[PDB]
């Protein structure tokens, strides 16, 4: 179950952008966005940079 | 960003590349101002180098609308955008003397050691200003005279 | 031991607590018994040297391979036993099984041994589950001779890639590298990863 | 130096190592190392091979070894080392701030010192302190004594943000608490079909709250969505029909 | 190995100053000053005598470089001893020493050959000022002004002996009644004297960020607020989006308000009253009641 | 007094004690100057805790 676990680990806990977009899309009555790349990734790269 | 990463790769940086990542130079040791609790000009928190504090706002107060996206204020130089860029723009420091990276010197074995064919102890002596090392010999001039 | 420590130790591939010996070659049983320590000797069939062991008399001498194949018949010296057969009662050590009888045989031993702990408490897993992890153990090589290849003598290297490098350097007249199959524990083999 | 000023030059310092690596050519040593490998007396030779590996790396990479002496240092963005103000007026900051500040200080003071002119012992000491400072910023306690800030407490370095149980690599493996979730006590219900399950309606009201809100402004029971959310907080009798 | 040690060695290598070296340095500094004036005069005119007759003064320049440098070596060992009293509280030991060197260099330049006195007193009273100035500049994590540094120095140093001399904890009011004599400045002085505590010393987990959920719901509020007020006119919404400013947002000056509306002659202050009855349409319909609630 | 009288059955979310913190002094928002201007209700120097 790739999409469920990727959903738990990202928009349901860490990504602020993600949670805001999902909440908004649910209240609006449109599709939830398909899960992409966490905002956490760019932070891992800024720290390795 | 595109969703397609075949693979990730890592490497060494370069001063000419570290200058590329940067948005300013931090040259003052000071952090936020004590009185008003705004960041201090051209230091480890300043809005010029990194990002504006609140969303769509410069520093002095000449713009606080959202109508102006991407403009750079000519009285203090901050850029009005989302405050989220406050965690994506990186600083840079320019050292009057070149230091070595600790990861290539204290690891076992030191790779710097293997490149420059020294004992590790003597490499440590060179780095820390406790032993002189002879860089370049003018051989042609020595043989001539 | 028989419980979850025996299963854990088997996957780690560490040396067992019994470590009963197996026949390094094939020969004839010749056991002299000292009261403090036994000595087990195997007189080779092919010829050459005879294997020597100094095993405690604290264990129990195992049943011998015989034409009768009685499991109740203890080992009586003067006999001819098969190569690889176990000598005393206890646990055979896996690294020795592998070096003596190739990669397949130690696979058989690990599947049977990890399964034989569950067939006692009454559980049953299907063999492929065990085999999918045993495959993750036995798939690297430690290299005796570096030769013309690049990698250091005595390093844990992948199998397929060891073969590929060896045939490329062989493609130019360069000397091959001499590598043997190694068994690894499921903590010293998940450490050596390539990502 | 006085006898043969025109014949050699040699520096003490890290700037020396940089002129040495620059004078160094990678392809030149590599061939000689391979020939050492080719020859016998392997025990001595094995040492020549450990060199060969490190050296050949830099040849295959396309990356010059010059990138091992820093002419500039990056500064991590300001948020990943935050200084936020607590509730009681106290400032709560991160440890990296003390390290960057330190390197900035020793740098500015060194450069003005070069401007003024100074003895060699003072300039060499300041260079030394700069190298040691940036060294502890990249990885603390890796060379001599770590640095402690308040009360003999080692400072969390910048390489400290990657390693450990709390580092960035370990973060996603351990697991975190989520949203849209609850838990309770389970009783058996032998009435249910194998695909059904029984859900306390007081808990299934909370869990699905936003959906109840969308359907509740959709019905028009609540004039606006924000008001509707308020309605589900007071468990009004109209929301159960929608929550079905 | 460790850093303070090697520098202590370097400082201790050269011989300490004494009464015999008083003459050596006094003569050398005087010679150096003369060398500086004689060398300086030739450069300004632009006409220079031969270099062979100037090499003598170059030799006096080498003597003056061994005098400035070696005299400096004599002063360093004093710099360390003077640092030993400052090292505990504020900064690192070697940072303080380095500032002693920097101050000494500034101090040596400001020196007079004619006056003769011990170096401890004169030099010490010149470099302790540099030490205290840089120390007071960069010791704190958040920079503070110098009079706050003095006030916190006085109250902190008198407080530390008052608590143990009295035998009881100094009350929050009388520590200020000694000098500040204000009850509202106590919290402030103890706030300025507090230092920022590490987040790692979890600690940050207790803190709450708040507002994304209510700034999202506030963007929705902006949607509904734009949608509701559609029954009015364009003129009246002009002065609604000018001095108040729905999308713009500034309590602006009425003249520049009158010059950005395309209508001049301050006519929008006369139309400002001809629509307040129409501006009563949203208040009588009671439409903005669910957002301020 | 600000405290609930003794014996009043309370459903959750209700107020038991009514306290207000003196709200941190920021500027009054202009959009909020028109929003509060149409009705005439000032966000006082106090938030509700
Ligand atoms: Zn500005």
Sheet strands side by side (includes D91-93): D83-85, D91-93, E197-198
* Closest to E97 in 3D by CA, of E83, E81, E77: E83
DSSP three-state, residue D91:
strand
Stated as kind and residue range, the H or E segment containing D191 is: none
Rounded CA separation E147/D4 (Å): 57
What does the H/E/C string look like for D23-69? HCCHHHHHHHHHHHHHCCCHHHHHHHHHHHHHHHHHHHHCCCHHHHE
DSSP three-state, residue D139:
coil
Are C164 and C179 in contact by the 8 Å Cβ rule? The answer is: no
The string over B104-129, giving b where at least 16 C-beta atoms fall within 10 Å of a residue's C-beta and e elsewhere, is: bbbeeebbbbbbbebebeebbbbbbb
- Whether F13 has its CB under 8 Å from any CB of chain D: the answer is yes
Q: What residues contact E45, with CB distance under 8 A and at least 6 apart?
A: none
The string over D204-229, giving b where at least 16 C-beta atoms fall within 10 Å of a residue's C-beta and e elsewhere, is: ebebbbbebbbbbbeeebbebbbbbb
* Closest to E116 in 3D by CA, of E36, E14, E29, E37: E29
Rounded CA separation E123/E110 (Å): 10
The string over B61-99, giving b where at least 16 C-beta atoms fall within 10 Å of a residue's C-beta and e elsewhere, is: eebbeeebeeeebeeebbbbbeeeebbbbbbbbbbbbbb
Interface of E with A (CB under 8 A): 212-213, 216
Distances (CA, A) of E84 to A36, E72, E94, E131, E156: 58, 19, 10, 12, 21
What residues are paired with C88 via a beta bridge? C61
Cβ-count burial of E293 within 10 angstroms (0-12 exposed, 13-18 middle, 19+ buried)?
A: exposed
Say whether the peptide bond before residue B109 is cis (omega within 30 degrees of 0): yes
Neighbours of C27 (CB within 10 A): 22
Are E141 and E196 in contact by the 8 Å Cβ rule? The answer is: yes
Integer-rounded Cα radius of gyration of chain E: 36
* E201 → chain D, closest CA residue: D153
- Whether D112 has its CB under 8 Å from any CB of chain C: the answer is no
Q: Reported resolution in A?
A: 3.5
Integer-rounded Cα radius of gyration of chain A: 12
E chain contacts of residue F36, beta-carbon cutoff 8 Å: 292
Are D58 and D26 in contact by the 8 Å Cβ rule? The answer is: yes
DSSP three-state, residue D101:
helix
Stated as kind and residue range, the H or E segment containing B50 is: none
What does the H/E/C string look like for C51-91? EEEEEECCCCECECCCCCCCCCCECCCCCECCCCCECECCC
What residues are paired with C42 via a beta bridge? C29, C51
Q: List the Cα angle A11/A17/A19 in 5-degree steps.
A: 35
- The phi, psi pair for D120, rounded to 5°, reads -70, -30
Are B78 and B47 in contact by the 8 Å Cβ rule? The answer is: yes
Distances (CA, A) of B119 to B111, B122, C74, D71, D186: 11, 5, 62, 25, 68
DSSP three-state, residue C141:
strand
Cβ-count burial of E128 within 10 angstroms (0-12 exposed, 13-18 middle, 19+ buried)?
A: middle
What residues are paired with C80 via a beta bridge? C28
Mutate to test the interface with B, among E4, E143, E194, E210 (most CBs of B within 10 A): E143
CB half-sphere exposure, F24, CA atoms < 13 A: 4
Cα torsion E180, E186, E190, E193 to 10°: value is -20
Tell me the shortest Cα–Cα distance from D76 to chain A, in angstroms.
7
Q: What residues contact D36, with CB distance under 8 A and at least 6 apart?
A: D45, D48, D52
D chain contacts of residue A28, beta-carbon cutoff 8 Å: 214
Using a CB cutoff of 8 Å and minimum separation of 24, what contacts does B9-16 make?
Answer: B10/A48, B11/D61, B11/D63, B12/D61, B12/D63, B12/D67, B12/D68, B13/A49, B13/D67, B13/D74, B14/D64, B14/D66, B14/D67, B15/D67, B15/D70, B15/D71, B15/D72
Rounded CA separation B103/D140 (Å): 11
- Whether B103 has its CB under 8 Å from any CB of chain A: the answer is no
What does the H/E/C string look like for chain E? CCHHHHHHHHHHHCCCCCHHHHHHHHHHHHHHHHHHHHHHHHHHHCCCCCHHHHHHHHHHHHHHHHHHHHHHHHHHHHHHHHHCCCCCCCCCHHHHHHHHHHHHHHHHHCCCCCCCCCHHHHHHHHHHHHHHHHHHHHCCCCCCCHHHHHHHHHHHHHHHHHHHHHCCCCCCCHHHHCCCCCCHHHHHHHHHHCCCEECCCCCHHHCCCCCHHHHHHHHHHHHHHHHHCCCCCHHHHHHHHHHHCCCCCCCCCHHHHHHCCCCCCCHHHCCCCCCCCHHHHHHHCCCCCCCCC
What residues are paired with E106 via a beta bridge? none
Rounded CA separation E13/E33 (Å): 27
Are D70 and B98 in contact by the 8 Å Cβ rule? The answer is: yes
Q: What residues contact B106, with CB distance under 8 A and at least 6 apart?
A: D139, D142, D143
Stated as kind and residue range, the H or E segment containing F38 is: helix F30-39
Rounded CA separation C37/E83 (Å): 73
Q: List the Cα angle B26/B30/B34 in 5-degree steps.
A: 140
Helical pair D42-61 and D26-38, crossing angle rounded to 10 deg: 150
Rounded CA separation E220/D224 (Å): 10
- Whether D88 has its CB under 8 Å from any CB of chain E: the answer is no
CB contact under 8 A, E143 and B130: no
Distance of CA C180 to the CA centre of its chain: 13
Rounded CA separation E12/D235 (Å): 82
- Whether A49 has its CB under 8 Å from any CB of chain B: the answer is yes
Rounded CA separation E124/C145 (Å): 70
Q: After which residues is chain E broken (C to N over 2.5 A)?
A: 201, 210
Of B19, B32, B88, the CB nearest to D83: B32
Q: How was this structure determined?
A: cryo-EM
* Closest to D229 in 3D by CA, of D206, D204, D197, D196: D206
Interface of C with D (CB under 8 A): 146, 150, 152-153
Are C5 and C18 in contact by the 8 Å Cβ rule? The answer is: no
Rounded CA separation D93/D88 (Å): 14
Rounded CA separation E179/E289 (Å): 53
Rounded CA separation D164/D167 (Å): 5
Are C179 and C144 in contact by the 8 Å Cβ rule? The answer is: yes
Q: What residues contact D210, with CB distance under 8 A and at least 6 apart?
A: A23, A26, A27
Q: What residues contact E227, with CB distance under 8 A and at least 6 apart?
A: none
CA torsion sign for B25, B26, B32, B34 is negative
DSSP C22-38: B-SS-EEEEEEE-SSEE
Q: List the Cα angle C64/C67/C70 in 5-degree steps.
A: 55
CB contact under 8 A, C150 and D52: yes
- The phi, psi pair for D69, rounded to 5°, reads -120, 125
What residues are paired with C22 via a beta bridge? C86
Stated as kind and residue range, the H or E segment containing B59 is: none
Are C21 and C60 in contact by the 8 Å Cβ rule? The answer is: no
Pairing of strands C37-44, C51-56: antiparallel
CB contact under 8 A, D121 and E94: no
Distance of CA B48 to the CA centre of its chain: 16
* Closest to B115 in 3D by CA, of B97, B100, B94, B130: B100
CA torsion sign for D133, D138, D140, D141 is negative
- The phi, psi pair for D234, rounded to 5°, reads -100, 10
* Closest to E223 in 3D by CA, of D215, A27, B84, D233: A27
Q: What residues contact D128, with CB distance under 8 A and at least 6 apart?
A: B128, B129, E3, E6, E7
- Check residue E106 and give left, alpha or beta (phi > 0: left; psi -120 to 50: alpha): alpha
Distances (CA, A) of C34 to C27, D173, F44: 22, 56, 99
Rounded CA separation C30/C43 (Å): 7
Are E80 and E94 in contact by the 8 Å Cβ rule? The answer is: no
B chain contacts of residue D132, beta-carbon cutoff 8 Å: 128
Q: What residues contact E288, with CB distance under 8 A and at least 6 apart?
A: E225, E228, E282, F35, F38, F39
CA torsion sign for D31, D32, D38, D42 is negative
Q: What residues contact D141, with CB distance under 8 A and at least 6 apart?
A: D154, D157
Are E242 and E249 in contact by the 8 Å Cβ rule? The answer is: no
- Whether B114 has its CB under 8 Å from any CB of chain A: the answer is no
CB contact under 8 A, B135 and D124: no
Tell me the shortest Cα–Cα distance from D94 to chain F, in angstroms.
25
DSSP three-state, residue D210:
helix
Are C45 and C62 in contact by the 8 Å Cβ rule? The answer is: no
Rounded CA separation D172/A6 (Å): 11
Q: What residues contact A30, with CB distance under 8 A and at least 6 apart?
A: none
CB half-sphere exposure, E25, CA atoms < 13 A: 24
Rounded CA separation B114/D52 (Å): 9
What residues are paired with C41 via a beta bridge? C30, C52
CA torsion sign for E240, E241, E245, E251 is negative
Q: What residues contact B99, with CB distance under 8 A and at least 6 apart?
A: D14, D69, D70, D130, D131, D134, D135
- Whether A16 has its CB under 8 Å from any CB of chain D: the answer is no
Helical pair D120-138 and E3-13, crossing angle rounded to 10 deg: 180
């Amino acid at each position: 179950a790739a999409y469920t676990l990727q959903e738990l680990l990202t928009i349901k806990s860490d990504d602020t952008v993600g949670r805001v977009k999902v909440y908004e899309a649910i209240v609006k009555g449109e599709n939830i966005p398909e899960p992409g790349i966490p905002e956490s990734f760019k932070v891992l790269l800024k720290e390795l940079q | 960003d595109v969703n397609f990463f075949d693979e990730l790769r890592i490497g060494l940086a370069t001063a000419e590349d570290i200058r590329q990542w940067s948005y300013g130079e931090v040259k003052k040791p000071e952090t936020i101002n004590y009185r008003t609790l705004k960041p201090e000009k051209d230091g480890l928190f300043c809005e010029k180098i990194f990002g504006p504090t609140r969303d769509w706002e410069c520093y002095c107060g000449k713009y606080k609308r959202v109508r102006f996206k991407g403009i750079i204020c000519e009285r203090c130089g901050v850029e009005v955008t989302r405050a989220k860029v406050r965690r994506e723009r990186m600083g840079h420091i320019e050292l009057a003397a070149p230091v070595t990276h600790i990861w290539y010197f204290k690891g076992v074995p030191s790779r710097l050691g293997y490149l420059l064919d020294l004992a590790p102890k003597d490499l440590e002596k060179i780095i820390y200003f406790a032993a002189y090392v002879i860089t370049s010999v003018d051989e042609e001039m020595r043989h001539n005279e | 031991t028989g419980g979850l420590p025996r299963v854990q130790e088997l996957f780690e591939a560490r040396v067992p607590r019994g470590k009963a010996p197996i026949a390094d070659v094939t020969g004839r049983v010749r056991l002299e018994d000292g009261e403090r320590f036994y000595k087990i000797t195997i007189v080779p069939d092919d010829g050459g040297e005879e294997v020597v062991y100094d095993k405690i008399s604290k264990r129990q001498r195992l049943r011998v391979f015989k034409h009768e194949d009685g499991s109740e018949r203890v080992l009586s010296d003067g006999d001819h036993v098969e190569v690889g057969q176990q000598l005393m009662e206890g646990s055979a050590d896996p690294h020795e099984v592998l070096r003596v009888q190739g990669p397949r045989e130690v696979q058989i031993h690990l599947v049977r041994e990890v399964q034989e702990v569950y067939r006692a408490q009454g559980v049953s897993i299907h063999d492929k589950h065990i085999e999918v992890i045993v495959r993750q153990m036995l798939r690297r090589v430690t290299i005796i001779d570096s030769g013309s290849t690049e990698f250091l003598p005595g390093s844990l290297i992948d199998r397929a890639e060891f073969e590929a490098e060896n045939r490329r350097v062989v493609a130019e007249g360069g000397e091959p590298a001499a590598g043997r199959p190694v068994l690894m524990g499921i903590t010293k083999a998940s450490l050596a990863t390539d990502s | 130096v006085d006898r043969y000023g025109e014949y050699f030059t040699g520096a003490m310092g890290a700037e020396s190592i940089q002129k040495l690596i620059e004078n160094f050519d990678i392809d030149a040593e590599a061939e000689s190392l391979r020939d050492v490998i080719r020859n016998g007396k392997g025990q001595k030779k094995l040492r020549a091979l450990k060199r060969l590996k490190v050296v050949a790396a830099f040849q295959q990479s396309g990356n010059s070894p010059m990138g091992m002496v820093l002419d500039a240092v990056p500064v991590i963005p300001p948020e990943l080392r935050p200084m936020v103000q607590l509730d009681g007026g106290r400032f709560a900051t991160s440890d990296l701030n003390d390290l960057y500040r330190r390197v900035i200080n020793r740098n500015n003071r060194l450069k003005r010192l070069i401007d003024l002119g100074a003895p060699e012992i003072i300039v060499n000491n300041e260079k030394r302190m700069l190298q040691e400072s940036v060294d502890a910023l990249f990885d603390n306690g890796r060379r001599g004594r770590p640095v402690t800030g308040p009360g003999n407490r080692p400072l969390k370095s910048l390489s400290d943000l990657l390693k450990g149980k709390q580092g960035r690599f370990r973060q996603n493996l351990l697991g975190k608490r989520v949203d849209y979730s609850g838990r309770s006590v389970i009783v058996v219900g032998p009435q249910l079909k194998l695909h059904q399950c029984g859900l306390p309606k007081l808990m299934a009201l909370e869990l699905f709250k936003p959906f109840v809100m969308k359907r509740l402004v959709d019905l028009n029971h609540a004039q606006n969505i924000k008001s509707a959310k308020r309605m589900v907080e007071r468990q009004r009798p109209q929301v159960w029909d929608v929550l079905e | 190995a460790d850093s303070v040690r090697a520098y202590l060695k370097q400082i201790g290598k050269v011989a300490l100053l004494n009464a015999e070296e008083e003459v050596e340095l006094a003569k050398r500094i005087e010679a150096g000053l003369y060398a500086t004036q004689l060398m300086t005069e030739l450069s300004e005119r632009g006409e220079k005598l031969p270099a062979a007759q100037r090499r003598d003064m170059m030799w006096i320049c080498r003597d003056g470089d061994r005098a400035k440098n070696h005299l400096l070596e004599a002063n360093l060992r004093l710099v360390v001893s003077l640092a030993k009293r400052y090292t505990g509280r504020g900064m690192a030991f070697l940072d303080l020493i380095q500032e002693g060197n920097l101050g000494l260099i500034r101090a040596v330049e400001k020196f007079d050959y004619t006056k003769g006195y011990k170096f401890s007193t004169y030099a010490t009273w010149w470099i302790r000022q540099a030490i205290t100035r840089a120390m007071a500049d960069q010791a704190r994590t958040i920079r503070i002004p110098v009079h706050m540094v003095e006030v916190i120095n006085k109250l902190g140093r008198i407080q530390r002996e008052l608590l143990q001399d009295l035998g009881r904890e100094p009350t929050p009011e009388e520590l200020a009644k000694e000098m500040d004599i204000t009850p509202e400045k106590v919290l402030e002085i103890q706030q300025y004297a507090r230092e920022p505590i590490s987040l790692d010393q979890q600690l940050g987990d207790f803190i709450e960020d708040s507002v994304a959920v209510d700034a999202v719901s506030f963007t929705l509020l902006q949607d509904q607020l734009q949608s509701v007020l559609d029954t009015l006119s364009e003129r009246e919404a002009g002065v609604v989006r000018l001095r108040f400013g729905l999308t713009d947002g500034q309590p602006r000056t009425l003249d520049e308000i009158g010059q950005v509306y395309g209508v001049t002659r301050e006519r929008i202050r006369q139309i400002e009253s001809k629509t307040m009855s129409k501006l009563r349409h949203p208040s009588r319909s009671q439409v903005l009641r669910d957002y301020l609630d | 007094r600000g405290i609930v009288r003794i014996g009043a059955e309370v459903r959750d979310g209700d107020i038991l004690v009514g306290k207000v913190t003196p709200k941190g002094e920021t500027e009054l928002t202009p959009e909020e100057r028109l929003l509060r201007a149409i009705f005439g209700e000032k966000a006082r120097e106090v938030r509700d805790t």
